[PDB]
């Protein structure tokens, strides 16, 4: 039930027991609070989706035993209770976009996909750095300053790191770079990047790099030629050390070109 005009509170009767409900969609209604009694009514719930609503307050502990896909996008959420996800040990795809969020409550160690785009962040909080199973992270359109190097993430399964439209100065990769050898998407567009460090050739599996619209790059390192898997590489609105986009330079030759400059360049 996911586009109707459901009123402020959607309290469920505490005396009904529906242990069969798996997916309870309530998006784009006019809720101003999370539904009241999910724990006592829908025990085996899996995908509680609540996007598009007007959820405002600091939420409740939400003691759901078998969640797998939370969703709180497009609400007006200021902050979550430090014990918000402290009772859902199975969450896998928490997503809170377009909110007004700044800090993260304890995230369970079972997170796999985690999207927090269009929020108002300042730094990737230490609660996301310590998720030993994280597998994707969309933190676009926040105003973060420092992207921690790969020696700070405690999870070897990074696959995607979207970080567009932030304000990122450096791309520190020198301390330890092979931990991100599985990263398959590193979107850094619209950032205040200055140079792309030469250790970025260690991300051998990098399949879609995106460093466009930086306006302060001026150079791709000759080490980037080792990214044999790249199939797209936007060059929009940044000036490099070569003249591309004739009819070719289709983000695959640029890797060959940058690779030939590694054998011997004159």
CA nearest to 155, candidates 190, 124, 120: 124
Beginning with the edge strand found earlier in the chain, give each strand of the sheet holding 136-138 in spatial order. 113-115, 136-138, 160-162, 185-187, 209-210
Residue 47 neighbours by CB distance under 10 Å? 16
CA nearest to 91, candidates 77, 76, 74, 105: 105
Alpha-carbon torsion, ordered 244, 250, 251, 254, to 10 deg: -50
CA dist 37 and 21 (Å) reads 14
End-to-end CA distance of the chain, in Å?
65
Q: Which residues touch 163 (CB under 8 Å, ≥6 apart)?
A: 139, 140, 144, 147, 186, 187, 188, 191
- Technique of determination: cryo-EM
Cβ–Cβ < 8 Å for 77, 52: no
CA dist 39 and 145 (Å) reads 39
Beta bridge partners of 194: none
CA distances from 41 to 3, 19, 92 (A): 22, 8, 22
DSSP-derived 3-state class of residue 226 = helix
Cβ–Cβ < 8 Å for 148, 130: no
CA nearest to 64, candidates 80, 42, 81: 42
Beta bridge partners of 136: 113
216-222-223 Cα angle (round to 5): 105
CA dist 88 and 108 (Å) reads 7
CA neighbours closer than 13 Å in the CB half-sphere of residue 138: 14
Cβ–Cβ < 8 Å for 131, 154: yes
- The DSSP line for 41-75 is H-TT--EEE-TTS---S-------SS----B-TTS
Separation of CA 30 from chain center: 26
CA dist 201 and 177 (Å) reads 9
CA dist 227 and 196 (Å) reads 13
Phi and psi based region of residue 154 (left: phi greater than 0; alpha: psi -120 to 50; beta: remaining): left
CA nearest to 108, candidates 174, 43, 63, 50: 63
């Amino acid at each position: 039930v996911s586009r109707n005009d459901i009123g402020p509170s959607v309290v469920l009767d505490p005396t009904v027991k529906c242990p069969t409900l798996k997916q309870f969609n309530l998006s784009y209604n006019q809720l101003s609070f999370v539904p009241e009694n999910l724990t006592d009514v829908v025990e085996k719930l899996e995908q509680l989706i609540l996007e598009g609503n007007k959820i405002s307050g600091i939420c409740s502990p939400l003691r759901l035993k078998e969640l797998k896909i939370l969703n709180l996008s497009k609400n007006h959420i200021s902050s979550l209770s430090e014990n918000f996800l402290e009772a859902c040990p199975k969450v896998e795809s928490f997503s809170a976009r377009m909110n007004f969020l700044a800090a993260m409550p304890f995230l369970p160690p079972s997170m796999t996909i985690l999207k927090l785009s269009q929020n108002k962040f300042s730094c990737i909080p230490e609660a996301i750095l310590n998720l030993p199973h994280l597998r994707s992270l969309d933190m676009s359109s926040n105003d973060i300053q420092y992207l921690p190097g790969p020696a700070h993430w405690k999870s070897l399964n990074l696959r995607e790191l979207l970080f567009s439209h932030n304000q990122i100065s450096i791309l520190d990769l020198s301390e330890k770079a092979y931990l991100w050898s599985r990263v398959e998407k590193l979107h850094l567009s619209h950032n205040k990047l200055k140079e792309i460090p030469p250790e970025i050739g260690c991300l051998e599996n990098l399949t879609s790099l995106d460093v466009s619209y930086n306006l302060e790059l001026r150079s791709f390192p000759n080490e980037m030629g080792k990214l044999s898997k790249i199939w797209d590489l936007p060059l929009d609105e940044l000036h490099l050390n070569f003249d591309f986009k004739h009819i070719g330079c289709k983000a695959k030759d640029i890797i060959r070109f940058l690779q030939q400059r590694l054998k011997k360049a004159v």
